[PDB]
Amino acid sequence: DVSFRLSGADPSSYGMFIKDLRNALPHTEKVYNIPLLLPSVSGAGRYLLMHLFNYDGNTITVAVDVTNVYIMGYLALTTSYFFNEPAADLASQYVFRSARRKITLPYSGNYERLQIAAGKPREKIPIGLPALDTAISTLLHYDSTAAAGALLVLIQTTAEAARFKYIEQQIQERAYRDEVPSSATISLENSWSGLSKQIQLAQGNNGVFRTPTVLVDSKGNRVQITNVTSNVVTSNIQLLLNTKNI
Numbered sequence: 028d029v030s031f032r033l034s035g036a037d038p039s040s041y042g043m044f045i046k047d048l049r050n051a052l053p054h055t056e057k058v059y060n061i062p063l064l065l066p067s068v069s070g071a072g073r074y075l076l077m078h079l080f081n082y083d084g085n086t087i088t089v090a091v092d093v094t095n096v097y098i099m100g101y102l103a104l105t106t107s108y109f110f111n112e113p114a115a116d117l118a119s120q121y122v123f124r125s126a127r128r129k130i131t132l133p134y135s136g137n138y139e140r141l142q143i144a145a146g147k148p149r150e151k152i153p154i155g156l157p158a159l160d161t162a163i164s165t166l167l168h169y170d171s172t173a174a175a176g177a178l179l180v181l182i183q184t185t186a187e188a189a190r191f192k193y194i195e196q197q198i199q200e201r202a203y204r205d206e207v208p209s210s211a212t213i214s215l216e217n218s219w220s221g222l223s224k225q226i227q228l229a230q231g232n233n234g235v236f237r238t239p240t241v242l243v244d245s246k247g248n249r250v251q252i253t254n255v256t257s258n259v260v261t262s263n264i265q266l267l268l269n270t271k272n273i
């Protein structure tokens with residue numbers, strides 16, 4: 028499957044990892060030239076395993092649902108960890124079976140619950156490659172409060188980067204120095220399901236959105252996306268959540 032090493036990492040090797048991540052996700056269709064994620068996949072094939080190595084070369088393996096890029100759980104050493112949600116519970120039937128013990132985290136995997144658990148919102152959590160290195164290290168030694176913050180970092184630097192070229196670039200820019208995400212980054216993370224839906228509805232509507240998506244731009248101004256000619260659609264989003272899953 029897919030792998031990333033913090034040791035010796037630079038914007039280029041990180042770019043390569045995110046390309047591999049994207050390429051690991053199956054699709055039979057591109058909508059407006061953007062891969063469309065499958066409505067569903069049955070069995071173990073539903074889950075991609077990412078091998079992540081911290082600077083010291085310690086590893087965790089992260090389980091990702093290939094239909095939505097949602098992290099379900101991870102394996103650190105001989106212990107598996109899964110979010111407290113039905114979908115992750117299902118995932119546990121298929122991944123890291125050979126783990127000696129299984130811990131269920133005291134929270135689900137969505138941003139609202141993770142931010143509560145961590146004690147701070149994504150806006151205040153620095154991200155980048157050094158932050159990912161830290162996050163890997165944290166997840167290696169169970170601590171549920173610290174893990175929440177680690178998971179917010181991990182999620183944004185893997186799944187959200189795969190979904191948006193702008194987020195990938197934000198992280199490449201933070202290769203050697205962490206920084207809290209721009210509001211544009213937060214906006215995009217928030218809008219993924221909504222943009223995926225509207226890009227899909229745009230087919231058979233002459234590339235026009237049924238409902239406009241309000242984003243925040245790089246310069247910090249609130250903009251609305253109304254059609255597929257927008258740069259968000261042509262030059263940013265890289266994966267579409269299948270409408271069947273919305």
Ligand SMILES: *[C@@H]1O[C@H](CO)[C@@H](O)[C@H](O)[C@H]1NC(C)=O
Pocket residue numbers: 235253254256257258
């Ligand atoms: C499509 O969106 C652009 C902004 O990106 C806007 O200027 C244009 O008016 C829109 N076109 C239509 C047909 O709505």
Ligand SMILES: Nc1ncnc2[nH]cnc12
Pocket residue numbers: 096097098099136137138182186187
């Ligand atoms: N658990 C998760 N995995 C991937 N992306 C997410 N966005 C919010 N929660 C997420």
